[PDB]
Design a protein around this ligand. Sequence first.
Ligand SMILES: Cc1ccc(-n2nc(C(C)(C)C)cc2NC(N)=O)cc1
Length: 258
Amino acid sequence: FQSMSVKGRIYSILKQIGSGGSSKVFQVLNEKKQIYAIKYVNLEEADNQTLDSYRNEIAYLNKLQQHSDKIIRLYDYEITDQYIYMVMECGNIDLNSWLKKKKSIDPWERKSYWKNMLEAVHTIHQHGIVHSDLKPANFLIVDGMLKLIDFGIANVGTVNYMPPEAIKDMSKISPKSDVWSLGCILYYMTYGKTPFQQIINQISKLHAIIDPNHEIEFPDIPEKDLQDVLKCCLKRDPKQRISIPELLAHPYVQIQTH
Ligand SMILES: Cc1ccc(-n2nc(C(C)(C)C)cc2NC(N)=O)cc1
C-alpha cells in the first residue's frame, strides 16, 4: 500500500495500469479521495535528445489544455533529472483495449468517437503539430468521451496505421498523414479490421500500402456517408486525400440520422 508526493500534494496509489520501458501509469487518489492517473517517467538513463522531447511534449500538453476538452488534462507535474511525475485525468479504458473487447460497435458511438478524434487532432495541427503515429492506443475513453493522450513528440508496435508517403519517403510528412491513420482507425471501427490487416508478411504489407494497383476493399454498408469518409481518408495521394477542415464539414459528422 504505497504513496507519492507531486508538488507538495500526496497521492495514494491504488493500482498500476501502464508499463513502459521507462514509464509507469498509476491509478491514484488525492487527499479528498478524487481519482487521477499519475505517469511516472524514469529519466535515470536518457540522452539529451530524448529529454528535450519530453520537455517539448509536456510544454505542448500544457499549452493546448485551454484550446480543447478532447485533449487529456494535465493538472500538475514534477520534473527532475531523475524522474517526471504527471498528474493527469483518469480514464475508463484506452480505445485499443476497447476495440479488442467490443465486437459490434454502435453507429452513433462510432460517429461520436470520430468527431472527438477530429477535434483533438485538428487542435494540434493548428499549433503545427503532426502526430505521425496515430493509433487507437493514443485515445482514452473518459466519461464516454474520447481524449487524445499524447502528441507523438516524445518516445509489439504495428505498421497497420502507416501512410504510404512515410514508406515512399525512405519533410514529406504533413497534416494529411494523420488523416490516413484516423481513416485506418475508423475503417477498423467500421469493418472490424485495419485496411491491410490480412497481410502477414510485414514486407508485403508495406508494399501493399504503397501500391497503387492494390485496391482497398470498401464493402457495401447502410451508412453511405461513412463509406465516403473512408474512401476519402484512404486515398494514397496526400494531395488528393481529404483535409481535417473538410472532414469537419462532411455530412457524416454534421448530418443527424444520416
Ligand atoms: C495501454 C494503456 C494503458 C494505460 C493508459 N493510460 N494512460 C493514461 C495517462 C492519462 C497517464 C496517459 C491513463 C491511462 N489509462 C486509464 N485507464 O486512465 C493508456 C494505454
